[model samples]
Target: MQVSVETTQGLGRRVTITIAADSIETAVKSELVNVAKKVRIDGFRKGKVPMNIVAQRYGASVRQDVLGDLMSRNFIDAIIKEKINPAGAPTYVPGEYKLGEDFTYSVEFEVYPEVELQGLEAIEVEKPIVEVTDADVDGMLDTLRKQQATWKEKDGAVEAEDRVTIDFTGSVDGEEFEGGKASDFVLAMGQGRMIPGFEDGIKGHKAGEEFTIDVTFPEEYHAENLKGKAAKFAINLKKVEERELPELTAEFIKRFGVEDGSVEGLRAEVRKNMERELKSAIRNRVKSQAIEGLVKANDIDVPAALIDSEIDVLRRQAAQRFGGNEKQALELPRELFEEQAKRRVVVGLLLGEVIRTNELKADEERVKGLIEEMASAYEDPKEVIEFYSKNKELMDNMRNVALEEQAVEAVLAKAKVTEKETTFNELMNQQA
Candidate 1:
C-alpha cells in the first residue's frame, strides 16, 4: 500500500491511496468460501454448495463489498499516517479495480484549521456589575401579584386590566360572520386577546352603553378568511370588573412554597432568585462580549463541512420546536441558520485551540456548580442536581459548559476589561 496527500485549496486536501489488488482478491475469496459454507442451495446441502457455483453467483457483490471496506480502512489509515484532522466525512472518489492489478482511490475533505491565537491581550470586554435591588424584588413581587390577581365587580367604565362581560356581534363587509357573535362572553382587557382597535374602542365605556366600533382583523390572523378584513362589533357593555391583586399575606407566601409562610420570607426568596438571575445574565453578557472580541480579533477559514453539519443540527433543533419530522426540517431555509452556524464553527475551533494550548480541563467543582446553577431553577433543586449527575450525557454537557466558561474567563483575564455597574433589569435586557 502507498498513500499521498496534497493541498487542493484553503483547508482542503486531496488524499489518494493505492493498494494491492491481491488483497481485494484475498478478501473476496475468503468471503465466497464462507458464503459457500453457510448459503443455502436447492440442489445441494447448505454446507456442500459448490465453490464455483457460489463464486459465479456472488463474486461481483462480494468484490464490491470488499473494495468498499478496504477503501474505508485504507482511507482512515492514510489520514492517520499523514496526520490529517478531518473536519467531517470525506467524499470518496474510487478508481477502477480488477484482479492482478494495483487499485487506487482518492478522497476529498476539509481539515480543521490551524488557529493562531490572537487578540487576547487587546480584546476589550465589559463586565456588568449587577445586583438585585429592593425595588427589583418589589417589582418581582408586584409581577407575582399581577399573575395571581383576581377580578371583582365594579360599577365603573371599562379600563385596562379590567374584566368585561359583554354581548358583541361582529361582521365583515357589513355581513355577519361565523364565530363573530357572542352572548355574555367574559373578556379580559389589556391582554391583546381581542383584535386591534376592539379593546381600545371598548375602553371608557360603562355598563348599559351600546355602540359599534370598527376594527380590522390582523393581517396575519389565524383565521384565513378574516385576515385583514374590516369588521365592526356591535357591543353591549354589560358589566365591568377591576383586577385586585392577592394580598401579600401568610397564605400568599405559603402558596409560593415558603415554609415559613411570611411576607418577609417571600420577599427574601424573590430577592435571592432575582440575584441569581442577575448573576447569570451578567456572566452571559460578559462571556458574549469576550467571545465577540475574540472572534473579531482573529480570522480563520471555517470548514464548509463543519458549517453544513452545524446547519443540520440547527435544522433538527428547529424541527423539534415544530414537532415535525426530518423532511419538514428541510423546509427551513439554510440561509436563515448559516450565519449562526458559521459563527458556532469558528468559535468551536477557537475555543478548542484555547483549550488545547492552555491545557485546560473541566474542573469538577466548577462542573458541579454549573449543574447546581441550572438545577436551582427547578422546584426540587437537590433532586434536579442528582438527576443531572445520574445522566452521563447531561453531566458531560455540563462539564463541557464549565470548560467553555473557564476558557471565556481565561480570555477575559488577558483581555482589557471595563467594569460598568448596571441594574438587574438593564443587565437582563442587555443583548448578549
Candidate 2:
C-alpha cells in the first residue's frame, strides 16, 4: 500500500491511498474461500462447493464485502502511519477497484490546528472588588419580605407598587385583534414588564372605574403585527390591592420552613451567604477580563469545521428548549451564529493551552468546597455530596472548573491588573 497526503489548507488535508494489485487479489481470494463454506450446490453439500463455482455464484457480493474490509483495515493503518488527528469524519471518494486492478481512494477532511502559542506575556485585567454592606443585607431581607407579601383590597386609588386587576380589549384600526383581550389580569402598577404606558395608565384607577388608554407599541416589540403601531385599549378597573411586605421575624421565617429562626440569626446567615455570592461574582468578572485579554493578545485562525459543529450544538440547544428539530429551523439560517461560535472556540482553545503550558492542576479542595455548596441546596445534603464525591466524572467536571479558576487567577497575578471597588448592592443588581 502507498499513501500520499496533500495540504488543502490550515488543518485541512486530502489524502490519496493506493492499494497494490497484490493486496486486492489476496483479499478477493480470501473472501471467496469464506463464501464457499456458505454456498449450496446441487451435486455437493455446503462447504464442499468448488472455488470457481462459488466465485461465479457470489462474486459480486464477496467483492463488495472484501472492499469494505480492505478499506477499514488499510484506513486504520494509514491514519496511524501518518500520525494524523482528524477533528471529525473524513469524506471518502473511491477510484478503481477491479479484480486485477490496483485499488485507490481519496479522503478529504480537516485536522486539529497546529497552534503556536504566544502573546500572553503582558495581559491586563480587572478584578471587581466589592464590600458587602449592612444596607445590602437589609435590602436582601426586604426583597425576601416582599416575596412573602400578599395582595389585599384597597378602597383608595391605585398607586405605584399596587396590584391592579383589570379587564381590557386592545385593537388595531378600531378592530379587535388576536391576543388583545383578557379579564381579571393582575398587573403591577409600576412594573416595566408590560408596555411603557399600560401599567402607568392603570395607576389612579379605583375599583369600578371604566376608561380608555391609547399607547404606542415599541419598534422592537415581539408581535410583528403591532410593532411601532398605535393601539387603543378599552380598560375596566376591577379591583386595586395595596402592597404589604411581611415583617422580618420568626413568623416570616416560618413561611420558608426555617425553624426557630430569629431576625438576627437570619440576618447574619444572609450576610455570609451574600458575601460568598459576591465573591463568586467578582471572581467571574476577573476571569472574563482575563480571557478577553488573552484572546486580544493571541492570534490563531480557528478551523471552519469546529465552528460549524459548535453552531450545530447551539442550534440543538435552542431546539431542545422550543421542542423542535434543528433541521426544521434550517430556513432561519442557523449558521448566522458562526461568528459567536468561532469566538467561543478560540477562547476554549486558548484556555486549554494556558492550562497545559502552566501545568496547572485542578484545586481538589476547591472542588470539594463546590460540591458542598451544591449539596447544600439539596434536601439530603450529605448524601448528595457523597454521591458526587464517589463519582469520578462528576468530580472531574468540578475539578476542571476549579483548574480554570486557578488559571485565570495565576494569569491575573502576572498580568497588568486593576481593581475597582464596588458595593454588594451593585454586584447583586448587575446582570450579564
lDDT of each: 0.74, 0.69
Candidate 1 local lDDT, 206-325, one digit each (tens): 877889888887755534345667887888888887777657679767877888798888877777676566766777788888878878988577777777677767888876664455
What global local distance difference test value does model 2 have? 0.69
Model 1 global lDDT (CA atoms, 0 to 1): 0.74
Q: Candidate 2, after superposition: displacement of residue 110 in Å?
A: 5.3
What TM-score goes with each of the models? 0.56, 0.57
lDDT of 1 at 46: 48
Model 1 worst lDDT run, 10 consecutive residues: 40-49
Clashes of each: 0, 0
lDDT (Cα, tens digit) per residue for candidate 2, span 302-342: 66567767766776765554346444334334445675786
Candidate 1: which stretches are off by over 4 Å? Answer: 1-9, 12-85, 91-108, 143-262, 361-401
**What pairs collide in candidate 1?**
none
